Amino acid sequence: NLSEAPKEIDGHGLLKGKVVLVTAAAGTGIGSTTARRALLEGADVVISDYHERRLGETRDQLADLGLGRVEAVVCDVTSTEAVDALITQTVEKAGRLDVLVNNAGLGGQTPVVDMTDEEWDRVLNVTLTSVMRATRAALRYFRGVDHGGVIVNNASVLGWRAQHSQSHYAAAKAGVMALTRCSAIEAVEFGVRINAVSPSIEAFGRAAEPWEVAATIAFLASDYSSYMTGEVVSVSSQRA
Amino acid sequence: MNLSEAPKEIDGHGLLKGKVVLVTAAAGTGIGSTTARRALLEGADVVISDYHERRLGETRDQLADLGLGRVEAVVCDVTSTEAVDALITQTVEKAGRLDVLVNNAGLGGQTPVVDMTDEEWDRVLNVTLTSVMRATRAALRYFRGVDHGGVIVNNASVLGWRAQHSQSHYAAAKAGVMALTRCSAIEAVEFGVRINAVSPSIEAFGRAAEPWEVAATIAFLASDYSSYMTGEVVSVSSQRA
Amino acid sequence: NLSEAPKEIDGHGLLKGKVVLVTAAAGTGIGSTTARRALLEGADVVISDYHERRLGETRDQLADLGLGRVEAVVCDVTSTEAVDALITQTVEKAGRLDVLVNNAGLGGQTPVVDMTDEEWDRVLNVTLTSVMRATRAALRYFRGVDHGGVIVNNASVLGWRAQHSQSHYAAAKAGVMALTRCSAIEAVEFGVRINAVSPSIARHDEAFGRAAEPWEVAATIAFLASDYSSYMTGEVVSVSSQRA
Amino acid sequence: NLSEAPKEIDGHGLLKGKVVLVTAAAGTGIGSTTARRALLEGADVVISDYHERRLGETRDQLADLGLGRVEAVVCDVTSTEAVDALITQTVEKAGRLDVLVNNAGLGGQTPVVDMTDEEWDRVLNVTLTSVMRATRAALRYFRGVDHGGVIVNNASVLGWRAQHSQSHYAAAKAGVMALTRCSAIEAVEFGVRINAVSPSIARHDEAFGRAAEPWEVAATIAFLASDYSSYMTGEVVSVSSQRA
Ligand code: NA
Numbered sequence: 001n002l003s004e005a006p007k008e009i010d011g012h013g014l015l016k017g018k019v020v021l022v023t024a025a026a027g028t029g030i031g032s033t034t035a036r037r038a039l040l041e042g043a044d045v046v047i048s049d050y051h052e053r054r055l056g057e058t059r060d061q062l063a064d065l066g067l068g069r070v071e072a073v074v075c076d077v078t079s080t081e082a083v084d085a086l087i088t089q090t091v092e093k094a095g096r097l098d099v100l101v102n103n104a105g106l107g108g109q110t111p112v113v114d115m116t117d118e119e120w121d122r123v124l125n126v127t128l129t130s131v132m133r134a135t136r137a138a139l140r141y142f143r144g145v146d147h148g149g150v151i152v153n154n155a156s157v158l159g160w161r162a163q164h165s166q167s168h169y170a171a172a173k174a175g176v177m178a179l180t181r182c183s184a185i186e187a188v189e190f191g192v193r194i195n196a197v198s199p200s201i202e203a204f205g206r207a208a209e210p211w212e213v214a215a216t217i218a219f220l221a222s223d224y225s226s227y228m229t230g231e232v233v234s235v236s237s238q239r240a
Numbered sequence: 241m242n243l244s245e246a247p248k249e250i251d252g253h254g255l256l257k258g259k260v261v262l263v264t265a266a267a268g269t270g271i272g273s274t275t276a277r278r279a280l281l282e283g284a285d286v287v288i289s290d291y292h293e294r295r296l297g298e299t300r301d302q303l304a305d306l307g308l309g310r311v312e313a314v315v316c317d318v319t320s321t322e323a324v325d326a327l328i329t330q331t332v333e334k335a336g337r338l339d340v341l342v343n344n345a346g347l348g349g350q351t352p353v354v355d356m357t358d359e360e361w362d363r364v365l366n367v368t369l370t371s372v373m374r375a376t377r378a379a380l381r382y383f384r385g386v387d388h389g390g391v392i393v394n395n396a397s398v399l400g401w402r403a404q405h406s407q408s409h410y411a412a413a414k415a416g417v418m419a420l421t422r423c424s425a426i427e428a429v430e431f432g433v434r435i436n437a438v439s440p441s442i443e444a445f446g447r448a449a450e451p452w453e454v455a456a457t458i459a460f461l462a463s464d465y466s467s468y469m470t471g472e473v474v475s476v477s478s479q480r481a
Numbered sequence: 482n483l484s485e486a487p488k489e490i491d492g493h494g495l496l497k498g499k500v501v502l503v504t505a506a507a508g509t510g511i512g513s514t515t516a517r518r519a520l521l522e523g524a525d526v527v528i529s530d531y532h533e534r535r536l537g538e539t540r541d542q543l544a545d546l547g548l549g550r551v552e553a554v555v556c557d558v559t560s561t562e563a564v565d566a567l568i569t570q571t572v573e574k575a576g577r578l579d580v581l582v583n584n585a586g587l588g589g590q591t592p593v594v595d596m597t598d599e600e601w602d603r604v605l606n607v608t609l610t611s612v613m614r615a616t617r618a619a620l621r622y623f624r625g626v627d628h629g630g631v632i633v634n635n636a637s638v639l640g641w642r643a644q645h646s647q648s649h650y651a652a653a654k655a656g657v658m659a660l661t662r663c664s665a666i667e668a669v670e671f672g673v674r675i676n677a678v679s680p681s682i683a684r685h686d687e688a689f690g691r692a693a694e695p696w697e698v699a700a701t702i703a704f705l706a707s708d709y710s711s712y713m714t715g716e717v718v719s720v721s722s723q724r725a
Numbered sequence: 726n727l728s729e730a731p732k733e734i735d736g737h738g739l740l741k742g743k744v745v746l747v748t749a750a751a752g753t754g755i756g757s758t759t760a761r762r763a764l765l766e767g768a769d770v771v772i773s774d775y776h777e778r779r780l781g782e783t784r785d786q787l788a789d790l791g792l793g794r795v796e797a798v799v800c801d802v803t804s805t806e807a808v809d810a811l812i813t814q815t816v817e818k819a820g821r822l823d824v825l826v827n828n829a830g831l832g833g834q835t836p837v838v839d840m841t842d843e844e845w846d847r848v849l850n851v852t853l854t855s856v857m858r859a860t861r862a863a864l865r866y867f868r869g870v871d872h873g874g875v876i877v878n879n880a881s882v883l884g885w886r887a888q889h890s891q892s893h894y895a896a897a898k899a900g901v902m903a904l905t906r907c908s909a910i911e912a913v914e915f916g917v918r919i920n921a922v923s924p925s926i927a928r929h930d931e932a933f934g935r936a937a938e939p940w941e942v943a944a945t946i947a948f949l950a951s952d953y954s955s956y957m958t959g960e961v962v963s964v965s966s967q968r969a
Contacts, residue, residue, distance in 0.1 A: 001432060009467070012253040014253060112857065112860055112904075112907075112911055112912075113861060113911070115857065115861055117805055117854075117858075120854065121854070124849065124854075128900075129846070129849075132837065132845060132892070132893075132896075136837050139837055147241050148241030148242075159903055160903075162688070162723035162725075162907055162909060163906075163907050164910045167857070167903070167907035167908055170906065170907045171853060171900035171903045171904045172900065174899040174900050174902060175896035175899055175900045175903075176896070177899060178885075178895040178899035179896045181479050181885075181888075182887055182888055182889065183837045184444065184479065185889045186836050186892075188243050188445055191243060193243075203426060203429055203470050203471060203643070204429060204470070215466075215467060219460045223456070224250070224457065224465075225456070225460070226250070226450075226453045226456060227445075227450070227453035227476050228475075228476055229445070229479070230444060230477070230479035230887045231474070231475050231476075231480065232480075232481070235469055235472075236472060238425065238426075238470070238471035238643035239472060239473075240418065240640070240641035353616055353660075353663070354620040356617055361610065365610075369605075369652060370598075376593055377593050380593060380594040384594060399659070400655075402662070403666050403715045404666065405667050406667070407663050408613070408667075411660070411663045413656070415652075415655040416655055416656045417652075418655060419639075419640060419648070419651040419652045419655035420593075420648050420652045422642070422643035422644075423593070423643055423644050423645070423647050423651045425643060426644065427648075471643045481886070482916060483873065483918070484913075487952075487955055493738055495737060665932065665967065669727055669934075672727055674727075688909065690913075700954075701953065701957070704948045709945065710945065711734070711941045712933070712938075712942070712965050713945070713965045714932050714967070715932060715965070716963050717968070718962060719957070720960075721956045721957045721960060723909065723959035723960065725902065725961070
């Protein structure tokens with residue numbers, strides 16, 4: 001029965017021994033749900049957020065599961081210096097980086113006629129520029145090693161959808177899809193694949209459970225998506 | 241790590257443990273056969289189908305040699321509705337149930353429109369698009385009659401989207417498959433069935449895809465990791481925007 | 482106000498002197514609406530349809546506008562022999578062909594689970610294969626003359642939309658989109674451009690809060706037939722579903 | 726031969742009695758080429774750019790056609806104050822505003838690993854944020870009157886294309902496409918349609934074996950500004966990459 005919220009599946013070893021860094025991972029949300037999935041799949045995890053108290057509580061909750069290593073690094077993704085320090089501390093604490101999941105993003109609800117420059121710029125900075133910062137810091141690191149890796153960006157159906165009062169967030173998210181495509185071509189040189197998931201915001205008569213989005217992230221992080229780069233996977237809007 | 245090097249096929253990770261997976265056009269070494277192998281590596285019992293009767297039996301025996309799940313073979317000309325209907329029934333009789341269908345069967349060509357023959361046009365469409373409808377109808381009829389659901393994976397093509405000289409028949413057919421995936425997916429929710437497609441490219445890494453890589457993505461779409469997805473088409477890999 | 486049905490605009494000489502052939506053009510429908518638009522734009526027109534008596538009446542109604550010349554040729558588009566004769570008789574009656582508009586489509590509402598092959602094949606034949614037949618016959622004509630031309634295909638939003646009980650029409654129309662792309666690349670060699678319009682259709686929700694007037698769809702067909710679309714080939718123009 | 730550059734076509738009266746504002750329209754390039762097309766089609770035009778002398782020169786050249794009125798207003802599109810005053814000045818000098826064409830854009834060639842925040846932000850500001858500023862200013866005007874109008878953005882195939890070293894420009898142009906879709910929905914209220922053209926560019930490549938002449942891109946913009954696109958809003962028209 002597809003209309004009933006399904007139970008989160010077990011791990012299947014998809015990421016065993018990989019170090020996975022996930023942003024916007026404080027408290028309930030796709031970020032923490034993705035960190036948990038990575039742990040379920042046998043990974044060591046580094047979680048990051050601007051919000052220090054809830055990041056710490058999230059780290060403790062993940063550690064309690066008694067799976068692999070869990071580290072937390074504070075990072076304001078609007079700061080280049082902090083995003084560069086995020087990658088450096090990740091490698092310091094966990095020995096390497098294998099997978100980056102770029103979740104950080106900021107929504108809103110404002111028609112173009114009422115749009116302020118301050119909100120427009122903030123949404124782009126948090127939702128789109130942050131992905132660039134973290135991809136830049138990650139690729140610099142991957143260029144310097146031989147084992148390569150994977151990045152997974154989290155876009156949104158709003159990148160495709162015509163939606164009243166969502167022009168900021170939609171433009172930032174369409175921006176993320178294009179950045180995913182173009183950085184993927186560049187990333188081949190460093191042995192890195194880059195793809196994105198695009199969550200819907202419904203065919204089953206229900207919304208996705210967070211775990212279902214994280215499960216598709218895990219696929220794009222895993223060797224099951226070996227040949228895919230520069231792709232954007234709708235979860236789930238029947239994207240044509 | 242060097243992405244232009246052909247990677248080694250990965251081990252199974254239990255993604256389809258206990259499921260019955262039927263794979264069409266699966267005689268040989270091609271994508272059908274490879275996908276059947278992936279299904280077995282993932283813990284599935286498998287039924288393979290094809291019209292190459294001897295080649296199929298031989299493929300079945302080789303897949304049986306792995307000593308994993310059960311392998312059954314069922315002959316089917318996918319241009320015959322009676323044969324496709326009988327494929328689903330025999331699969332269900334032999335293996336006990338059907339959980340996942342993979343629609344591989346397709347037919348290529350190279351002919352400009354200006355000199356296209358009706359015969360070639362009709363055959364490409366029949367093998368490539370109409371077979372997928374035949375197999376999907378028969379499976380949804382089965383699924384309708386039981387309480388469990390399941391999953392169908394279609395195999396489309398980047399040619400559905402790409403403007404390509406001399407491919408109008410195959411491109412139209414594969415674009416047809418994408419649309420059929422979408423519409424049948426909305427209908428299939430009722431029976432607890434998800435329907436998606438993979439879309440192979442024909443190069444960012446400077447190498448072609450290994451058939452095993454396409455099969456790995458099919459396995460994803462057959463598995464619970466794709467739990468929320470239905471009526472999607474996943475490019476493997478053309479950077480589809 | 483955008484939610485009110487707008488009045489049809491005047492002609493602007495976008496097709497002055499061109500021979501435009503339009504299929505599924507008898508009676509009331511996008512075909513006859515497209516033929517009228519062609520005439521408003523200065524064209525001579527050949528209209529085609531299955532139903533002989535209805536086609537003659539539309540031919541008379543159109544010639545009465547007192548604009549370009551209007552000819553009619555009967556064609557069952559499921560017949561290769563008849564589509565081949567449509568182009569032949571078009572050139573015989575009007576002297577040449579400049580623009581072909583492929584309108585023919587057959588709708589349905591049947592789930593896959595209960596789909597009959599009879600309906601499936603019929604829908605594919607009328608909606609997709611006829612477009613291949615007509616494009617083949619046109620390109621064959623263009624290969625034999627010292628000029629090119631333009632084809633405009635009529636697809637549908639259903640090519641993209643996931644819709645219960647429309648898998649046949651949807652497959653056929655997505656098929657028309659891919660045919661439009663591939664045939665366009667080939668048609669370059671003949672100096673022929675090929676594009677498609679993709680009209681929205683109610684599922685039974687629209688940006689303006691109204692359906693399109695047929696004239697609005699024909700006006701976009703006119704654009705794709707005209708020199709305004711000079712650089713475009715192999716495109717599919719949504720009218721109008723905010724296609725991303 | 727479609728590989729031979731076609732001659733710019735005559736006006737056909739598609740914009741009679743309209744005031745058309747075009748940005749980045751000084752000198753050579755799509756803006757000035759678009760302003761010329763607006764004039765050929767019977768519009769009065771206001772052209773805008775940052776370069777005062779080059780803008781004045783263009784104004785005099787377009788005025789020397791002896792067609793519609795040409796005004797010029799200097800505007801730095803990275804400045805909200807200047808963009809707001811661009812719209813005000815347009816309405817003051819020309820009487821009203823009917824069509825805005827958002828042409829400004831800025832590119833680069835920089836791999837992500839080498840990307841500076843400053844270049845990233847500059848490219849997004851000029852290519853994407855400027856379109857928001859201009860659209861916000863125009864919609865404020867249209868809201869305050871009981872007539873509608875039309876906005877046309879100019880995106881790029883780069884919104885869709887995976888291209889080494891263009892991640893900033895690509896993100897910006899993909900963003901323009903999404904902004905076009907969402908602003909189109911809101912604009913219905915004010916009687917305004919908003920669509921975009923998306924010009925192709927050679928990867929190395931193009932169907933015709935030639936790049937588009939600027940006029941051909943302007944001719945499609947004219948269609949999007951005209952009543953021939955009556956039913957379209959929130960659409961992105963590829964000129965011409967065979968967008969599926
Ligand atoms: Na051939």
